[PDB]
Amino acid sequence: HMERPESELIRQSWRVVSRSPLEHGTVLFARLFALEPSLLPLFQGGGQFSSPEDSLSSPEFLDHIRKVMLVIDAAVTNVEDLSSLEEYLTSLGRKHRAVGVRLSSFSTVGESLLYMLEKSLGPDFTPATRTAWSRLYGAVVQAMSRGWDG
Ligand code: HEM
């Protein structure tokens, strides 16, 4: 349950972001690392003390930014009803727990998301657009938090 006018604020703004997902994704992660810098070591080359062993164990950053935005894409596609994605999102959450990402970190992503959108859109980031994106992202996180034994 999210109604057409709000779904449409989301579809439109996402269209602008979708012109350049890596560029905007990089803004999201930069804010993210400013807020939680301890997440950096989870990516290939994000360590101060790591060998080339991480390159295969760990995700590469720009590649993973693509994956993040693809998942957000699916959420947008299902903005009006998100239940067909809960299976997946519960599975994705489990993966993030498995490699040491705290649930609390996904809040920091939310802020970073709103920050990216705000930079991306300026006055077009209307209060209703911000609120709707909180609801949408919160719903995504809700589904994902299922993978944390909770
Ligand atoms: C602090 C935030 C985040 C960190 C540190 C992070 C870190 C990682 C890491 C380390 C992996 C590799 C997982 C593995 O192969 O075991 C990964 C995979 C992934 N992440 Fe994230 N992630 C974050 C947020 C997100 C968010 C918000 C999304 C989507 C909404 C996302 C989507 C993905 C996807 C799709 C994969 C691929 C997993 C697969 O192949 O099944 N991540 N993430």
Numbering used by the authors: 0 to 149
Report text from the authors:
However, by freezing crystals before complete disruption, we managed to determine a structure in which we observed about 40% CO ligation and a concomitant swung out histidine conformation. The mobilization of the CD-loop-D-helix unit could facilitate the His64 dissociation from the heme iron, unlocking its swing-out displacement, thus leading to the increased CO binding velocities observed by rapid mixing. Removal of the barrier to His64 early swinging out increases the velocity of binding by one order of magnitude, reaching a much faster rate limiting step in the Gly-loop mutant with respect to WT Ngb.
Ngb is over-expressed in hypoxic conditions and it may be involved in gas/redox sensing, radical scavenging, and/or signal transduction. The dissociation of His64 is the rate-limiting step for ligand binding and it triggers a repositioning of the heme which slides further inside a large internal cavity.
